[PDB]
Amino acid sequence: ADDIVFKAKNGDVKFPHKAHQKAVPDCKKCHEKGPGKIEGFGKEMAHGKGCKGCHEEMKKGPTKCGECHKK
Ligand code: HEM
Ligand code: HEM
Ligand code: HEM
């Protein structure tokens, strides 16, 4: 429900929105241009300092391609 699925050509990439809404405070970290869609998203950030960035740093979360890219 509140969750969000991102159709991927290598397996859907589940992303706990509501969950990340309880784990992370400031949303500007994800919604720099205010809450909404992120025109430009993709492997780009999803890989760089997008998701893996706020993951590896703490060493927690889908850091492998078998975690994000894996229906
Ligand atoms: C070295 C491991 C990884 C490889 C080789 C990899 C490869 C790719 C590739 C090739 C794409 C482009 C798909 C396309 O648009 O045709 C992509 C997109 C994406 N990746 Fe990764 N990825 C890896 C790990 C991750 C991880 C760990 C996450 C989640 C934290 C992630 C999240 C995404 C998302 C959300 C997209 C955009 C949706 C899509 O177009 O599939 N990736 N990745
Ligand atoms: C004030 C807190 C937040 C609000 C109000 C919010 C709201 C939204 C809304 C409304 C959408 C989709 C637009 C729509 O359907 O109307 C969205 C998408 C999204 N949100 Fe959040 N969100 C918040 C926190 C977060 C956080 C903390 C992250 C990252 C940890 C995040 C990551 C995303 C991503 C990746 C998308 C998908 C957009 C895309 O496909 O490019 N959100 N958010
Ligand atoms: C669209 C980008 C992102 C995606 C796809 C993503 C995906 C995920 C997923 C699938 C988990 C597994 C946790 C679970 O639900 O059990 C996770 C965990 C986590 N993510 Fe993210 N994430 C993203 C962005 C971020 C950002 C920006 C931050 C920091 C601002 C962040 C911080 C964390 C932390 C700290 C955890 C560990 C869970 C815990 O608190 O135990 N993530 N992430």
Short mmCIF file of N, CA, C and O in Angstrom, two decimals, residues 3 6 16 18 26-27 29 33 36 45 56-57 66:
data_model
loop_
_atom_site.label_atom_id
_atom_site.label_comp_id
_atom_site.label_asym_id
_atom_site.label_seq_id
_atom_site.Cartn_x
_atom_site.Cartn_y
_atom_site.Cartn_z
N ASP A 3 3.56 1.54 0.54
CA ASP A 3 4.82 1.18 -0.08
C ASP A 3 4.87 1.75 -1.50
O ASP A 3 3.95 2.45 -1.92
N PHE A 6 9.03 0.10 -7.97
CA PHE A 6 9.60 0.71 -9.16
C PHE A 6 9.98 -0.35 -10.19
O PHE A 6 11.00 -1.02 -10.05
N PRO A 16 10.50 1.20 0.94
CA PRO A 16 9.67 1.55 2.07
C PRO A 16 9.60 3.06 2.20
O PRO A 16 10.50 3.65 2.80
N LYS A 18 6.87 4.95 3.58
CA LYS A 18 6.37 5.24 4.91
C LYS A 18 7.42 4.86 5.94
O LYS A 18 7.63 5.58 6.92
N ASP A 26 14.09 14.75 8.09
CA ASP A 26 14.02 15.66 6.96
C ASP A 26 13.80 14.86 5.67
O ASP A 26 14.52 13.89 5.41
N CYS A 27 12.81 15.30 4.91
CA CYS A 27 12.49 14.63 3.65
C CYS A 27 13.28 15.32 2.53
O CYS A 27 13.49 14.73 1.47
N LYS A 29 16.01 15.50 2.15
CA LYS A 29 17.12 14.63 1.80
C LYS A 29 16.75 13.81 0.57
O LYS A 29 17.62 13.37 -0.18
N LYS A 33 13.42 19.32 -3.82
CA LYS A 33 12.53 20.27 -4.48
C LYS A 33 11.10 20.04 -3.99
O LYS A 33 10.16 20.09 -4.77
N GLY A 36 7.34 15.00 -3.62
CA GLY A 36 6.80 14.76 -4.95
C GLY A 36 7.70 13.82 -5.74
O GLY A 36 8.48 13.06 -5.17
N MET A 45 21.27 8.21 -9.02
CA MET A 45 21.28 8.40 -7.58
C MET A 45 21.05 7.08 -6.85
O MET A 45 21.75 6.77 -5.89
N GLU A 56 25.24 2.30 2.58
CA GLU A 56 26.59 1.87 2.87
C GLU A 56 27.16 2.68 4.04
O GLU A 56 27.76 2.12 4.95
N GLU A 57 26.96 3.99 3.97
CA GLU A 57 27.45 4.88 5.00
C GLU A 57 27.20 4.27 6.39
O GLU A 57 28.08 4.32 7.25
N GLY A 66 21.41 -7.91 -5.60
CA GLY A 66 20.51 -9.02 -5.35
C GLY A 66 19.48 -8.66 -4.27
O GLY A 66 18.63 -9.47 -3.92
#
